[PDB]
Amino acid sequence: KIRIKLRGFDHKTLDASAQKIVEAARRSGAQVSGPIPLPTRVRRFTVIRGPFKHKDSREHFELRTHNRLVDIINPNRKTIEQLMTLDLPTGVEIEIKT
Amino acid sequence: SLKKGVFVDDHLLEKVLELNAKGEKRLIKTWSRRSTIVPEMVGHTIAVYNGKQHVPVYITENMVGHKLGEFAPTRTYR
Amino acid sequence: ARKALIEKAKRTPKFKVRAYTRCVRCGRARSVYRFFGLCRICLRELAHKGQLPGVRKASW
Amino acid sequence: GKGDRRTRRGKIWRGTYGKYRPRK
Amino acid sequence: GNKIHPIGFRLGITRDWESRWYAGKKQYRHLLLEDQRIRGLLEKELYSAGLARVDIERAADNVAVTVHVAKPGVVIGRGGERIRVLREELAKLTGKNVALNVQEVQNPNLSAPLVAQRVAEQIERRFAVRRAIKQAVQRVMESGAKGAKVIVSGRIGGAEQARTEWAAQGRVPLHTLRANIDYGFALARTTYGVLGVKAYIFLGEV
RNA sequence: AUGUGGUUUAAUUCGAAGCAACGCGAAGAACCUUACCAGGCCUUGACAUGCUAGGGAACCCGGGUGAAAGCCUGGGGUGCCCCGCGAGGGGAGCCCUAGCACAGGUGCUGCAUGGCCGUCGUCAGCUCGUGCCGUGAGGUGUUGGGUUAAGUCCCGCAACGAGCGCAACCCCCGCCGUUAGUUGCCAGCGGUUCGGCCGGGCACUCUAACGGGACUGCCCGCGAAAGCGGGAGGAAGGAGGGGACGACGUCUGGUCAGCAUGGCCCUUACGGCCUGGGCGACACACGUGCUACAAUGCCCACUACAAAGCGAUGCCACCCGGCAACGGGGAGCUAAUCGCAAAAAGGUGGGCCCAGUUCGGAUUGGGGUCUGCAACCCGACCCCAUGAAGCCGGAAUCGCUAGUAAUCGCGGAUCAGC
Ligand SMILES: NC[C@@H]1O[C@H](O[C@H]2[C@@H](O)[C@H](O[C@@H]3[C@@H](O)[C@H](N)C[C@H](N)[C@H]3O[C@H]3O[C@H](CO)[C@@H](O)[C@H](O)[C@H]3N)O[C@@H]2CO)[C@H](N)[C@@H](O)[C@@H]1O
Numbered sequence: 041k042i043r044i045k046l047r048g049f050d051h052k053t054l055d056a057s058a059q060k061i062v063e064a065a066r067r068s069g070a071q072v073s074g075p076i077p078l079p080t081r082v083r084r085f086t087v088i089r090g091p092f093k094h095k096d097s098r099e100h101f102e103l104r105t106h107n108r109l110v111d112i113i114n115p116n117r118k119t120i121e122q123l124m125t126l127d128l129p130t131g132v133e134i135e136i137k138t
Numbered sequence: 139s140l141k142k143g144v145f146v147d148d149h150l151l152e153k154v155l156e157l158n159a160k161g162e163k164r165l166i167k168t169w170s171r172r173s174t175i176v177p178e179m180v181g182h183t184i185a186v187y188n189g190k191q192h193v194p195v196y197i198t199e200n201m202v203g204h205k206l207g208e209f210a211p212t213r214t215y216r
Numbered sequence: 217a218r219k220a221l222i223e224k225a226k227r228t229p230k231f232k233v234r235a236y237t238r239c240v241r242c243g244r245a246r247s248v249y250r251f252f253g254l255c256r257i258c259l260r261e262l263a264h265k266g267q268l269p270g271v272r273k274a275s276w
Numbered sequence: 277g278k279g280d281r282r283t284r285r286g287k288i289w290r291g292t293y294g295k296y297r298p299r300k
Numbered sequence: 301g302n303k304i305h306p307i308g309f310r311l312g313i314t315r316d317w318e319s320r321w322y323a324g325k326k327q328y329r330h331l332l333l334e335d336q337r338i339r340g341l342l343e344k345e346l347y348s349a350g351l352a353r354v355d356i357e358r359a360a361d362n363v364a365v366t367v368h369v370a371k372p373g374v375v376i377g378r379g380g381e382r383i384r385v386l387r388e389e390l391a392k393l394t395g396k397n398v399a400l401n402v403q404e405v406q407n408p409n410l411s412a413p414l415v416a417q418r419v420a421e422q423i424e425r426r427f428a429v430r431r432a433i434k435q436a437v438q439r440v441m442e443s444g445a446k447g448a449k450v451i452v453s454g455r456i457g458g459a460e461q462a463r464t465e466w467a468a469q470g471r472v473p474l475h476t477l478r479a480n481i482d483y484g485f486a487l488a489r490t491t492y493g494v495l496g497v498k499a500y501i502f503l504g505e506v
Numbered sequence: 507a508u509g510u511g512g513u514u515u516a517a518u519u520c521g522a523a524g525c526a527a528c529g530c531g532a533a534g535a536a537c538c539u540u541a542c543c544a545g546g547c548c549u550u551g552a553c554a555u556g557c558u559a560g561g562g563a564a565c566c567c568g569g570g571u572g573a574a575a576g577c578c579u580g581g582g583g584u585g586c587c588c589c590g591c592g593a594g595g596g597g598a599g600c601c602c603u604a605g606c607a608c609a610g611g612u613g614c615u616g617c618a619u620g621g622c623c624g625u626c627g628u629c630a631g632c633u634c635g636u637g638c639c640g641u642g643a644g645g646u647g648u649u650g651g652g653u654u655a656a657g658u659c660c661c662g663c664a665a666c667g668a669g670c671g672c673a674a675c676c677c678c679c680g681c682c683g684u685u686a687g688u689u690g691c692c693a694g695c696g697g698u699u700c701g702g703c704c705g706g707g708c709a710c711u712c713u714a715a716c717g718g719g720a721c722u723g724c725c726c727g728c729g730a731a732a733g734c735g736g737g738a739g740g741a742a743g744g745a746g747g748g749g750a751c752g753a754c755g756u757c758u759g760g761u762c763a764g765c766a767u768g769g770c771c772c773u774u775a776c777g778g779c780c781u782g783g784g785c786g787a788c789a790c791a792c793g794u795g796c797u798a799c800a801a802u803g804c805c806c807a808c809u810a811c812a813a814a815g816c817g818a819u820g821c822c823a824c825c826c827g828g829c830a831a832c833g834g835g836g837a838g839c840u841a842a843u844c845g846c847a848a849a850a851a852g853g854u855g856g857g858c859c860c861a862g863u864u865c866g867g868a869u870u871g872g873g874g875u876c877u878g879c880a881a882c883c884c885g886a887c888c889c890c891a892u893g894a895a896g897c898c899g900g901a902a903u904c905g906c907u908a909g910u911a912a913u914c915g916c917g918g919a920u921c922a923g924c
Pocket residue numbers: 096097098628
């Protein structure tokens with residue numbers, strides 16, 4: 041019944057941050073459809089390296105928004121405690137849906 | 139090319155309309171070459187700026203759909 | 217001119233189409249990535265330093 | 277072909293749509 | 301004119317960012333401009349302390365700003381008189397609640413941007429441009445490094461023709477990703493124009 | 507079409523100059539941009555910090571004039587320090603004018619510079635320590651024999667080692683495993699208005715994190731060795747394929763117009779603001795490109811090949827009006843969920859019948875649509891008409907060794923639009 045989207049630039053601070061949200065609902069409540077990894081939005085920017093004319097020759101930058109997903113089916117209040125404000129957000133995004 | 143207005147500068151009209159209520163002046167000069175020549179506001183002589191000076195363009199009937207700057211040519215020997 | 221102009225481009229103007237971008241550092245009109253407000257130059261610079269988060273050398 | 281507005285291909289190349297290339 | 305920035309070459313590995321805050325595609329723009337005029341102000345009124353990194357994090361209207369320095373004493377003031385003034389100065393531009401840790405760089409001769417600054421400082425006080433380099437490297441090797449290298453640009457000693465002095469010791473393998481090479485750059489605005497100081501310190505590995 | 511040379515201009519702003527300038531700075535010149543010109547204007551200035559001084563001190567609403575900028579104006583206005591006074595004067599904010607320190611300059615110098623870049627060259631190199639040799643500069647090492655993509659490794663050797671390079675450490679793509687179920691499925695079985703749509707299921711596919719896998723490890727031949735030829739197993743051999751990555755140095759290379767910066771120059775102007783024009787000129791010359799010159803083709807209709815990215819001052823399904831561009835309405839989607847989205851080439855049918863053509867789509871007349879204050883100089887699109895050169899290109903000359911070239915469409919950045 042409860043749906044949480046997880047964005048972020050860093051793939052270790054999702055597979056960490058939101059794989060600890062799997063323990064803080066399994067231990068203190070009921071069923072979880074595990075963490076599901078979403079299509080990542082790669083942004084790429086492409087820049088003429090030098091300040092002045094050197095139009096061939098460039099540098100290539102991406103900015104990669106990783107997305108992950110978790111679903112919890114049984115809303116206990118034994119769960120919404122860690123999943124409420126036992127805070128360890130770091131450089132991560134939090135979407136909460138139903 | 140538009141169809142909901144002819145996007146003509148009020149500062150010109152206003153000055154032309156409130157000349158048509160008695161007005162037969164030649165020292166009418168403008169910088170709005172971007173304005174359509176409006177339904178029969180003819181007879182008058184508007185001087186249009188080419189970016190260097192105003193040129194007297196005598197406005198007759200055959201040339202009404204057009205813009206003003208079409209008669210103030212901006213570049214020399216073409 | 218590039219002072220009286222970094223200033224002018226911030227003023228809200230008669231007509232929104234007279235409006236435009238500018239590298240909020242390196243104060244500059246052309247190649248200005250709107251996702252950053254950053255001139256390609258003053259940008260490759262930050263991108264290198266680590267001052268643009270999650271931005272990284274692309275290689276594929 | 278590709279240079280002709282009144283073909284379908286002229287449209288495609290130009291990215292446009294019209295009589296000569298309708299949206300289904 | 302060759303050669304990539306050694307930090308930027310490493311960001312994914314053996315070097316992480318000076319700004320660890322996510323944003324959507326319409327906040328990022330402003331959370332950056334702020335992010336920057338921050339360092340613009342900090343670095344300017346905090347040279348004395350000698351700041352290496354100006355780390356930053358976010359989580360919606362609060363900001364980390366974990367400034368690393370050689371001389372913590374100078375940012376604080378005897379008790380807490382300056383660190384107050386700074387938290388106060390910050391929120392006047394940053395319309396948010398500015399937190400603010402402070403860190404000691406335990407050994408400043410292994411912080412490349414400090415070593416740069418050091419050498420740059422000497423140059424502005426017309427010092428022996430070539431020995432500065434020589435010494436600086438030594439100092440850095442002396443505090444236990446795996447290698448180092450320092451570079452100064454041109455107009456060395458106010459000479460008419462620009463030149464370029466360098467010196468180095470041990471390893472500085474700029475092509476190895478798994479190296480950990482703190483890099484740093486200092487200016488040096490002198491009576492006869494700018495010189496440029498670059499500094500490389502090898503330490504790391506697996 | 508575009509960039510450049512030249513010429514022309516009031517101006518056609520500046521730079522870039524063989525390779526390594528010329529679809530380059532420009533990842534978006536109608537006004538903005540804009541640095542150029544012509545005219546109307548402002549001068550302590552569009553922006554920063556302070557000083558000397560009468561005037562008002564927060565502020566609000568018009569009018570005249572003009573193209574706009576600006577300028578000449580008439581009103582609404584009395585909040586706060588201070589009580590020192592029970593009659594309110596003292597430059598506390600703040601705002602004005604008059605001076606002053608200053609701002610401002612995309613003015614010049616890349617041969618005063620930083621930085622960043624280009625370049626020889628991803629070429630196999632350039633060095634150092636100590637020892638040894640030489641009066642010395644220097645040499646040896648780094649020569650020699652083998653080998654490699656490689657100063658890669660091997661064997662030798664008055665050298666023994668090392669550093670910057672090479673390779674490796676990193677990303678993408680090939681095979682498999684683990685972890686995970688609003689995207690996958692009759693794979694299994696069930697219901698299906700037969701659209702994975704419905705309960706249901708992660709098997710598979712995929713998505714994205716972490717592992718595995720390759721080592722000349724194994725077999726035959728050559729070799730002193732490195733390594734070389736061949737074989738098996740394996741998705742993949744001997745660097746599996748593509749990136750990222752650029753030694754000491756060279757070019758007084760490039761940029762003072764991104765920025766930073768030493769010096770010199772302008773300060774009712776070399777600063778500023780505006781409207782208008784110019785950067786779009788056209789007797790010419792060159793570079794890079796597009797579309798062609800057709801039947802292995804062109805046109806029209808039907809027909810799932812699938813594959814990276816963008817989208818809430820947005821992507822717009824679906825209905826309707828218009829030949830259409832587009833205009834009305836209007837659902838879904840902060841997006842693996844909804845949209846841009848048709849992929850095109852291909853396939854199936856039908857037409858054309860070798861013609862300057864149903865090839866080609868320049869030029870030009872006319873009617874429109876959209877963005878935008880505004881589309882004459884200067885936008886893209888649609889529709890009618892008009893159909894130019896062009897029948898595969900002189901001397902010269904360019905790219906590419908495999909999922910390459912050739913060909914076909916698709917997306918993005920900048921961006922109102924282009
Ligand atoms: N990081 C720098 C960038 O590298 C670019 O890539 C350049 C090179 O790395 C690249 O490689 C060269 C090629 O230049 C040259 N004309 C012929 C040569 N065979 C190529 O080498 C080739 O083989 C090597 C090793 O096998 C590869 O690693 C290399 O990247 C590949 N291109 O081709 C480009 C130039 O011809 C550009 N040099 C330069 O514009 C840009 O700065």
